[PDB]
Structures are given as C-alpha cells and as structure tokens.
C-alpha cells in the first residue's frame, strides 16, 4: 500500500561566452559628466537559436539590468583620458530602461588585464555577430 505523499529571467536560451565584474557609466552630454549606471557582472550572452551575442549587465543585490544591447560589429572601443582600465563606446540601442535608447557608455574594470581581456572578447563577439 503506497501512502499518498504530502502535496523567468529570459536568459535560459543563452550561452555565457564571457563574464567579468565591471562598473558602467553613461555620459551626460548636457552636464558634461559621467554618471554611474551600475556595478556588477557584465556577461556576453550568445543566443543558441540566432547565434547573436549581447551584453547583459545587472547591478549587485537588486539585480536590476543596467546594460542590455547587441554587441554591434560597427561599435568601437576607445580609451578614456583618465583611465588605463576602461573603454568608452557609443551604443545606438540599449533597452535596460525599457524603450530603445542611444548612449555613450564607459565601462571600467578591476585592472588593465580585465579591460584588455574584455576588449579581445568584445571583438570576438562582433565577428560572431557578423556571420
């Protein structure tokens, strides 16, 4: 006699190509200054159906998205004058805050090595997205 026993991130279809801790800034053009957007893990995610690679970054603790955009082939990583461990680039369509919006981002890392590794991986992703 068997006794009767007692009674969605959207990231499930994606491969993590690369992950690194980072601080993200957005450039306020009007007031000519950089503003922090979030600190946390920056991931490169490859969609297993479309093979398209995006940047997805979430803030520590609250887990709120601070970057969500395709790593476009036409983007270019440029240095910031103040830093040897950061890149700046223009993004034409980021959907972190909802509607697609253009930004000038800067992303800073724990070290130059991390920044350099990121650049390499970034450019790898661009080639994937080209195919």
């Amino acid at each position: 006699i068997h006794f009767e026993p007692v009674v969605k991130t959207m990231e499930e279809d994606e491969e993590v190509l690369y992950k690194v801790r980072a601080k993200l800034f957005r450039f306020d053009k009007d007031a000519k200054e950089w503003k922090e957007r979030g600190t946390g893990d920056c991931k490169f995610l490859k969609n297993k159906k479309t093979n398209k690679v995006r940047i997805l970054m979430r803030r520590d603790k609250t887990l709120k998205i601070c970057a969500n955009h395709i790593i476009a082939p036409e983007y270019t990583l440029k240095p910031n004058v103040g830093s040897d461990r950061s890149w700046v680039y223009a993004c034409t369509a980021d959907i972190a805050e909802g509607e697609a919006e253009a930004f000038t981002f800067a992303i800073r890392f724990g070290s130059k090595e991390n920044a350099d590794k990121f650049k390499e991986e970034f450019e790898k992703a661009q080639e994937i997205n080209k195919k």
Binding site: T9, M10, K61, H69, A90, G110
Partner: protein, 196 residues
C-alpha cells in the same frame, strides 16, 4: 499596486543621494538641498511580483521644509536617515520620529545610519539604540559604497507584502534590437582610485 514611502532626516544626511542611487545607479557628489519634497516612483522585482514605492523624499533643512508633516499624510512606510559622521543628526532622530508617527501611527519604519564609508565615524555603533523601544528596523548604510543599500527596501517590502521570505529577483531580460564621443573620451571618469 504601490506604497507611499516618506524619507525624512536632517539636511545633508544623504536622503536624495540614496534615492538617486536606487533610481539611476548614479552617485551624486554635490549637495543640492531638496526644496519641500521630491516624489519618485521606484520599482523592485520580487519573487512575489513587482512592488512600487512612491518615494516622497523630503527636505531636511528647516528653511526648505515646505509642508513639513503635511508630506506624511497617508504614508504607508518610512525611512528615517542620519549621518554616522554627524552626532547632531542622530540627536535629531527622535524629533523626526515624533513628527512622523503623530501623522503615521502604525507603519513600518527603517532607521538608517548613512555614510559608513567615511573613516572617522562619530556616532558609535554601540550608541545607536533609539530604534529598540520604537520598533524601528536599523541598518548601517552607505549610498557611496552601496553598503547595505538594498536592505531598507527589502525589509519594507517584506513588511508591506506580509511575506518574510520575499526576495529580490532578476528582471526578465528581453532580446535587444557623433563626435560627442570625443568629449566623452576626454572627460575623465570619476573616482579612478576606487577598486571598480
């Protein structure tokens, strides 16, 4: 769908900075005194669904106080802020509490000691006991370093929804679709000495 939250405390304790950090991720270094009140919606995603706080960030300076306790009307929760580097701000906590609970008789309230990132702390941990008899939750926080920055909202969400096991969860991440760049490149990033 939403809860009215009033944020009170002495001028310069970091109320507006704390809220801004939560709204946009930014850290505002400049002290621009709040004039009366500023209202901001703030949403968190939890395992029990979205919770929306309508944050009434009030002026701490007497000369900019505006409607004062008039702001507290129908608040469902609150944060009382002080600055652990300024003893007078802790001394004034009972005054803010008094004015608040006279209007809001039975709401969950979190007491926050801000600026714990600053080396020379003045309000000793052992001194902070006002919350005990008043049934306030207490946290050491820093809007600058983000130390415990999520705790006040997490506690409040748990009390308001009535679920001790409520947790923040990751938002769903929907598929995503000139030489102002030169200015950006030649404007130094702030706080280049920080770990990140």
């Amino acid at each position: 769908v939403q809860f009215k939250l009033v944020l009170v405390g002495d001028g310069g304790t970091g109320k507006t900075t704390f809220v801004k950090r939560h709204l946009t991720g930014e850290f505002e270094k400049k002290y621009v005194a709040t004039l009366g009140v500023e209202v901001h919606p703030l949403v968190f995603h939890t395992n029990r669904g979205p919770i929306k706080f309508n944050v009434w960030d009030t002026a701490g300076q007497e000369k900019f106080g505006g409607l004062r306790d008039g702001y507290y009307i129908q608040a469902q929760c609150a944060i009382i802020m002080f600055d652990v580097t300024s003893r007078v701000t802790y001394k004034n906590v009972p005054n803010w509490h008094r004015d608040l609970v006279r209007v809001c008789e039975n709401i969950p309230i979190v007491l926050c000691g801000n600026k714990v990132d600053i080396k020379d702390r003045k309000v000793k941990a052992k001194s902070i006991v006002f919350h005990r008899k008043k049934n306030l939750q207490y946290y050491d926080i820093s809007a600058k370093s983000n130390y415990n920055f999520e705790k006040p909202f997490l506690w409040l969400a748990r009390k308001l929804i009535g679920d001790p096991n409520l947790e923040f969860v990751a938002m769903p991440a929907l598929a995503p679709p000139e030489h102002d760049l030169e200015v950006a490149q030649t404007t130094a990033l702030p706080d280049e000495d920080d770990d990140l």
